[PDB]
Amino acid sequence: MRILLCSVGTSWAVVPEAMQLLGSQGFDEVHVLTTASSKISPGVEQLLRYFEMHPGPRFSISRVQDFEDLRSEQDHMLFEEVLWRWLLQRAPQAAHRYICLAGGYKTISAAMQRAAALFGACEVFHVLCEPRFGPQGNREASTLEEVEQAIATNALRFVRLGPEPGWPQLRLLSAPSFPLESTLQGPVHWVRASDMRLRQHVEGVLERSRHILAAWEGISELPIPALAAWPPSHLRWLHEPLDPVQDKAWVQALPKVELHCHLGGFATHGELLHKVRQEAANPESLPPVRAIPLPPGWPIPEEPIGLERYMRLGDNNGSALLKDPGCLRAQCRLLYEALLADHVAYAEIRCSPANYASASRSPWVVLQEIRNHFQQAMEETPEDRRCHVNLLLTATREEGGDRSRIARHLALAITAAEHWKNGCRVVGVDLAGFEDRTTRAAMFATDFEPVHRVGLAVTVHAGENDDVEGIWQAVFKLSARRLGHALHLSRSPDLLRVVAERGIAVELCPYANLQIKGFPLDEEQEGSETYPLRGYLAAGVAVTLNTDNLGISQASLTDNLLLTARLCPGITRLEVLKTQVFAAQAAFANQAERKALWARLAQVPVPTD
Amino acid sequence: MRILLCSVGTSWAVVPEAMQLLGSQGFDEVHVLTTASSKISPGVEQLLRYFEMHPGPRFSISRVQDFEDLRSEQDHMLFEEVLWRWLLQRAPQAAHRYICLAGGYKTISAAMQRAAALFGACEVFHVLCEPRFGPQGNREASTLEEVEQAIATNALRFVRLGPEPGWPQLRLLSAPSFPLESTLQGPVHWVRASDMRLRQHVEGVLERSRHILAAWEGISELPIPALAAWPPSHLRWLHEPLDPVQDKAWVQALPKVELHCHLGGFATHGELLHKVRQEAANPESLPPVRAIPLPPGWPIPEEPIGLERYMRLGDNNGSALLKDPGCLRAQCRLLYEALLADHVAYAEIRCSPANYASASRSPWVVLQEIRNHFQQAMEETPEDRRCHVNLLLTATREEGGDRSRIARHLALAITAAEHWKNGCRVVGVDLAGFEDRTTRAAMFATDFEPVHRVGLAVTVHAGENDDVEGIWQAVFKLSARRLGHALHLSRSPDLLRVVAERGIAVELCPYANLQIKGFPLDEEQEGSETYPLRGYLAAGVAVTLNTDNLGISQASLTDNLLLTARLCPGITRLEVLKTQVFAAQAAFANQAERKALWARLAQVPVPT
Ligand SMILES: [Zn+2]
Ligand SMILES: [Zn+2]
C-alpha cells in the first residue's frame, strides 16, 4: 500500500529516520536506491543491520552498477533513468509513493523531486533530526544507537511538500514496458539500466509540452487523444502499412467494436456446433447434422460462392437448433465467450427471436431469454474485461414483406426497448431483405415512426447490388443510421458525399464480402474492382469493420481486420484505429455505454517493435 | 532581461559558480536570498566582495530577518512565503527566471524547486563543482581565489533540470499584491513577510486543483488531440471554471466556428450601420435612419424583450437596406472583417437572396454577388488567418404567404449547390420560422428530397417557443441535421436522447437567447430556469454556441462564449473547446473545408 523510497546519496541514517513519518502505522513496502560507492558500503551494511533488527515492512536496497559518483549532466541522466526504472518497478501504482527528498549528496534530491513531479506521488517530504546527537551532542544522528535515540524521545520533524500527482502521459508507463535488470549479488539488489528509453519517452512527452508550433500538425488529426502521448516512433509505426502476419498480436490485443454479428451464424460447424448441440434441453427432438461441405479453401475460397450458398452453409444452426432453449442458451454463452476471447469491448448482436420461436416459446420469451443469457454473461465478467452486448432485431425473409410479420417485429422491438435500460438491451432493428423489391416496398410502406420515437435506430443490408436509389431511400425515408456492406457507394460520388457528410456508417465485412462477392487479394495497386475500404476512408465515410456470421465465415473480428492489408494494399494501422473509432461513434449506445466503450478504446495496445 | 536566483547556506561559492551558466556574457541582473544564521554571515560578506570588478548589472543579496535554522515545517512555511514574495519581486516574469538549486541547506533547495513549478522558470538548474580538486585535491573548489581559479579552469558542471511553465493560476500574482519589507543595513536586505497571505492563496489554489484533478484525470476526454500535449498544469487549468473577466483574452484568441449568423442582422446600428450606408451606390434611395431605442442595459436587459421586439430592433438594416448593391457589398466585407477580428476559422452565413432582390436584380444575382464578395474576401487574406465562409439560404415566408416562395428558395439552393464547388458554397437551407403551424405545415407538404440529393443539408429554427412534435418532424421527416435554439429539449427526455444519439446539433445563441427569452445570470448554482447548455452537454447533445444576429445582439462570438460563464454556473474552458469541436463536427463542410478547419482548430492558445 504505502511505499517509501528515500534514495540514499550518503548518510544511511536518513532512511530509518524517514520510516517514522507515519508513526505507529508503518510503511508497508520499503525500497532504497543508492550509489554503489565504497563509502556507502558501511552505510548499506548498517541499513541491513537496522532492517534485520526491526522486522515488519518489506526491505530492499538497490545499488546502481557502474555508477560511483554523480559528476556531470550525463552521470545525472544515467541515475535519472535508473531512478525512473526502479521507481516504476518498485512502486507500480501511480499514487502509492511517499518520496523522500533527504539524502542527496549531488543533485540526487533534485532529480528525485523531479521524478516525483514527472511520474507522481502522494507525499514528497523531507526529514529533519534535531542536532542534539553525536559524540558531543552537536550534530545529527549518524549511528544505529544515535538513530534509535532519534526515533525514541521524538526529535524528528517532517517537512511534507505535497502529493505532486504527476504527468498524466507518463503515468501510463509501467515496469513491464521498461524492464530493469537486477542482480541479487547478496542481500542487496544491484540495478543497471540497459537503454535510455524511459528518459527519451519522458523528454519527448515534455518537448511537445512546451512546443507550440512544432507540436501542431505533428500530432493533430490523430483519431485517439491517447495516441498523442505515444512516442514519435510509435506514431510513425501507426502511419505504416498493416502486416497481416506480424501485426496479428497487435490486432488481437486491440479493443474492438462489433456492430454486425448475427446470432444464428456462430456455431454452424465444427466443435461449437456440437457443443450447442449437446447443451440441448431435449436431445431427441434435435435435427440431424446435415452434411454441409465447406467450399475448398475456406475461409478464403478460390471463387466467390454467392449469397444463397453462403446462407445454406449455416443450415445446421439457426432455426434448426435455437428453438430449443438449451441450444439457445449454449449459443448465447459461447458467442459471448467468443466475443470475450477477441477483445471485443462493445458488441451489437443481431438476432431474430421469431426464427427461434417455438410453439411453447413465443418470440418475446425467446428475446427475453437471449437478453438474460447475455446479461448474465456480462454480469459474470469484470468491468475492465467485459463486453457490452446490445441486441438488434432482424427482419428476414427475402421476397415478401407480409405486413403481419413487420408489425409483430417492430412491436416486439418497441416493447423490448422500454423493458430494459441497463446492461443488455434492444437498441434497434435490422432490415434484411432490402436486396429485393417486394420486401423493400413493404419496408418503405411500413411506419417506422414508433421505432424512431422509442429511441430505436435502423440498419439496412446495403450495396450487395449496385442500387443507389435503395441507399437513398433507406437514408432519408427510413432514417437508417448504418448501412450493411454497401460495397458500391464509390460509383456515385454524390451518394458518397451525402453518406460521408451525414455521418452514416458503412458496415464492411472483409472475409464475408470476399467469400460472397469476391475481391482482389495481395494486389500491388488499387485498381477498379478492389475492395472499397480505402476509397471510403478517403471519402470521409464512417467505415466499420465487422463480421457477419462468426461460424459461416469461420473467422473472428481480428482476422477480419487482418485481411484489410490483403484486400486494400497499403492500409495503415492508424486506419484500423480510425475504423475502430468510427465503429464506436456509430454504435447505438447510450451515454454510459459510450463512455465505457471510449474508456476501453483509450487502452490501445503498445506496439512491441 | 534574464534573472538569476540562488539560495545560500554555509556554501557561498554556489552563486559565483552559478553565474557561469552563460560564460563571459553573464546575466543582465542577479539577486541572492539567504538566511540570518551567524554561520552564513561571513559568506554574505565574501559574496559582497566577490563583485566590484563587473560594472553594469547590480547584484543584490537578501537575508530573512529572524531565521536561524529551518528545524520544523513551521519555519519552512514562513521561509516559503518570504521566498515566493522575493521571487515575485526580484523575478517578475517566468520567461527570464533562472532558479539556482545549489546552496540548499536543509529544505531550501526543495523549496526553491517547488517555487519553480508553481510560479514558473525558464531554467531550473543545479551547479556541481566536480572535480573536488581543492587544497590537496579532496574538496570542492569553494571560498576565495579557489572559486575564480575554478571559473578559469571549468570544473563547473551545470545540471539543467529543464524549464518550468508554472501554474497558469499562479502567474497572475504580482509583487505589489503581496509586498515584502526591505530593511536595508547597507548593501544587504533583511526582507521579511508581513502576513502569510501569498501562501494561503497558493495552498487554496492547489487544494481546489487537487479536488479537480481527481474527477478530471486523463487525456482521453480532450476533444482536441493537440490538448493531450499540454503540461499538467495547463490541462488542469483547462478543467477549471471559465472566468468571464480574466479569460477574455484567451477566448478572444481561440479559433472559433460560426454556424448561425444572419447576414441581415450584422450592421444593425451604430458605426457599422453608418459605414454600410455610406457605401451605398444610390444614397438618394437610402431609407431614413429609424429611431430604434435599444432596451436599457443592452446588450444585457434586465427583462426579456421578446422575439417581435428583437426583430424590430434590426429594422434599419436588412431587407430595406441591402437591396442596394453597394450596401450588400459593404455588408459582406464588414461581416468578413468581423469574422476575421474574432479569430473565426469557419462560418456559415444565413441569407435570404430573394429578400434583397429588385426589379433588375434577381435572387440568383443577389446570391451570386454575396458568394463572390465572400470569395474575394477569403482570397485577400492569408490562408493561416483565412476564415472559410459557406452560405445557408433562409426559407422564411409570410403569414398566409406562398408555397411558390419556398419552391423558388429550394430551387435556388439546388442550383447554387451545383454552380459552386470551391471556396464559398451554398451548403444548406435554413427553414426559418417553423414556430407557427401555418408555415410549419407547408414545410412538411414540400418535397425536400431534391434538397437531400444535391447534398444540401437542412437546419430549422425549432425549439424556441414551439412544440417538440415539430422537433420530431424536423429530425425524421425533414432530415434536419441541426436545430436552431431549441432551449426546451430537456423537458422531454426521449427527444433529448434521440437528439444526443443521432448527433443532431443544437444551435444555442447565448446573447440572443438572453435578450429574447429570460435566463438567470450569475446564479452560481443550477436551477429550473437555468440556461440548458450544461444539461445539453451532459446529456451528450452536440451543442454549438452561435451569435444569431451580430448587430441586433450587439455581441461577437467571443462575447457569446464568455456569456455562458454567467448563464451556466461552473462552465469550464474545456467545455468551450467542446462546443467549438461540436461546431466543427456539425458544420455542413466537405472534406477540404473540414480538414482546414481541424488544422486551424488544433491551434489552441496557451493561457497566460
Ligand atoms: Zn448480414
Ligand atoms: Zn435564426
Author numbering:
A (entry chain D): 1 to 609
B (entry chain B): 1 to 608
Text taken from the publication that reported this structure:
We show that Cad1 binds specifically to and acts as a ring nuclease for the cyclic tetra-adenosine (cA4) in the regulation of the nuclease activity of Csx1, and the ADA domain of Cad1 converts ATP to ITP. Thus, TaqCad1 is a dual functional enzyme mediated by cOAs, both as a ring nuclease in regulating Csx1 and itself, and as a deaminase to accumulate the level of ITP. TaqCad1 assembles from three pairs of monomers (CARF dimer) to form the hexamer with a pseudo-D3 symmetry. The ADA domains create a donut-shaped core, while the CARF domains extend outward in a propeller-like configuration.
To elucidate the extent of structural heterogeneity while achieving best possible resolution, we performed dual-structure reconstructions for each complex. Capitalizing on the inherent pseudo-C3 symmetry of the hexamer, we extracted all dimers by symmetry expansion while tracking their originating hexamers. Subsequent conformation-based classification of the dimers enabled high-resolution refinement, yielding optimized maps that resolve critical features of dimer architecture and ligand binding. TaqCad1 dimer is formed through both the CARF and ADA domains. The Rossmann fold core of the CARF domain (second P-loop and α6, residues 105–120) and the helix-turn-helix insertion (residues 211–229) comprise the CARF dimerization interface. The ADA domain forms helical contacts involving α21- α23 (ADA interface I, Fig. 6A). The CARF interface undergoes a significant increase in the buried surface area, from 1161 Å2 in the apo to 1753 Å2 in the cA4-bound state (~50% gain). In contrast, ADA interface I exhibits an opposite change in buried surface area, decreasing from 1236 to 893 Å2 (~38% loss). Mutation of the equivalent tryptophan in LngCAAD abolished its activity. We designated the apo dimer as the relaxed (R) state and the cA4-bound dimer as the taut (T) state. Superimposition of the apo with the cA4-bound structures revealed large differences in both the CARF and the ADA domains (RMSD 4.1 Å for 453 Cα atoms), consistent with cA4-mediated structural remodeling as previously reported for LngCAAD.
